[PDB]
UniProtKB/Swiss-Prot annotation, chain A:
Subunit structure as annotated in this protein's UniProt entry: Homotrimer. Interacts with the capsid vertex protein; this interaction binds the peripentonal hexons to the neighboring penton base. Interacts with the hexon-linking protein; this interaction tethers the hexons surrounding the penton to those situated in the central plate of the facet. Interacts with the hexon-interlacing protein; this interaction lashes the hexons together. Interacts with host dyneins DYNC1LI1 and DYNC1I2; this interaction might be involved in intracellular microtubule-dependent transport of incoming viral capsid.
Recorded superkingdom: Viruses
Family stated for the protein in its record: Belongs to the adenoviridae hexon protein family.
Coiled-coil segments: none
Organism (species): Human adenovirus F serotype 41 (HAdV-41)
Expression triggers: Expressed in the late phase of the viral replicative cycle.
Subcellular location: Virion; Host nucleus
Described purpose of this protein according to its UniProt entry: Major capsid protein that self-associates to form 240 hexon trimers, each in the shape of a hexagon, building most of the pseudo T=25 capsid. Assembled into trimeric units with the help of the chaperone shutoff protein. Transported by pre-protein VI to the nucleus where it associates with other structural proteins to form an empty capsid. Might be involved, through its interaction with host dyneins, in the intracellular microtubule-dependent transport of incoming viral capsid to the nucleus.
UniProt protein name: Hexon protein
From Swiss-Prot, chain C:
Upregulation: Expressed in the late phase of the viral replicative cycle.
Database matches in HAMAP family: ADV_CAP8
Gene: L4
Family in the record: Belongs to the adenoviridae hexon-linking protein family.
Name the UniProt record assigns to this protein: Pre-hexon-linking protein VIII
Mod. after translation: Cleaved by the viral protease during virion maturation. May cause the middle segment to be shed from the capsid.
Source organism, top-level taxon: Viruses
Keyword Phosphoprotein: yes
Length: 49, 48, 178
């Protein structure tokens, strides 16, 4: 029978992570980006969809 | 025709995730010195 | 009223370069009600050191102005882009080409016909420098966290009135239609 594939992925028992580091990499507990003045010495609103 | 009931293993809950009413501003704990109106646990209502 | 006050952070609008709104430090603050007068005497003082740091880094980084969030930064205090004179090496001798093409039959599918070649160094920056609005790398330089060493203690007039987000400094009025 002519067939079309179907793909799905499971990541159960885990939580998606998007680290604040500029390179997305664990360079330390205190992220570099989350410590620059721009996000530290200036309030910022945030919107996510 | 009969069959067999399913199987529910009701049991206590892993790590006791519950018996202790953990983070909840309405029912908090205390670890303060006896002679001190203070506390040592504030437990805001967002922490798992 | 108070005195070691908790600095008023400045918000940004990635839109028009001028800043937007302002508010006391909404989040970053300790919770000392579980403390006694041995570290509630040190949190008070760590915050004072924070205030002094903010003052110094404000008077050392900012460019002294007369209105907290100016409605239109003048064209001399906004970081301008000064690129380098672009130099194009004009890749041919126009006279030489035109001459030979007219002469002989060269249809010409450095140069061999003539060893002449000249750059055309141009100007690269702009005609009229930018005027209104500063970039992010200037926001974190101009609007350092502002410390308000006393609350709204005065007549309506004297009151940092560039803090309320809904201010139209052009007309000294709160906008509407909301």
């Amino acid at each position: 029978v002519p067939s079309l594939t179907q793909k799905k992925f499971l990541c159960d028992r885990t939580m998606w992570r998007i680290p604040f580091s500029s390179n997305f990499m664990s360079m330390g507990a205190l992220t570099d980006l989350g410590q620059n003045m721009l996000y530290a010495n200036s309030a910022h609103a945030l919107d996510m969809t | 025709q009969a069959a067999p009931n399913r199987p529910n293993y009701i049991g206590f809950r892993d790590n006791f995730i519950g018996l202790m009413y953990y983070n909840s501003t309405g029912n908090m704990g205390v670890l303060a010195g006896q002679a001190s109106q203070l506390n040592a646990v504030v437990d805001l209502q967002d922490r798992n | 009223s108070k005195e070691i006050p908790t600095p008023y952070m400045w918000s940004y609008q990635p839109q028009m370069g001028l800043a937007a709104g302002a508010s006391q430090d909404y989040s970053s603050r300790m919770n000392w009600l579980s403390a006694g007068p041995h570290m509630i005497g040190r949190v008070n003082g760590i915050r004072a050191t924070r205030n002094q740091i903010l003052l110094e880094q404000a008077a050392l980084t900012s460019t002294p102005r007369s209105q907290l969030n100016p409605p239109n930064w003048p064209a001399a205090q906004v970081y301008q882009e000064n690129p380098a004179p672009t130099t194009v090496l004009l890749p041919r001798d126009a006279e030489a080409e035109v001459q030979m093409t007219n002469s002989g039959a060269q249809l010409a599918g450095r140069s061999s016909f003539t060893p002449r070649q000249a750059y055309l160094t141009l100007q690269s920056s702009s005609s009229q420098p930018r005027s209104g609005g500063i970039g992010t790398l200037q926001f974190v330089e101009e609007f350092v966290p502002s410390v308000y060493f006393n609350p709204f203690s005065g007549a309506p007039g004297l009151y940092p009135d560039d803090f309320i987000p809904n201010y139209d400094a052009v007309s000294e009025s709160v906008d509407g239609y909301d």
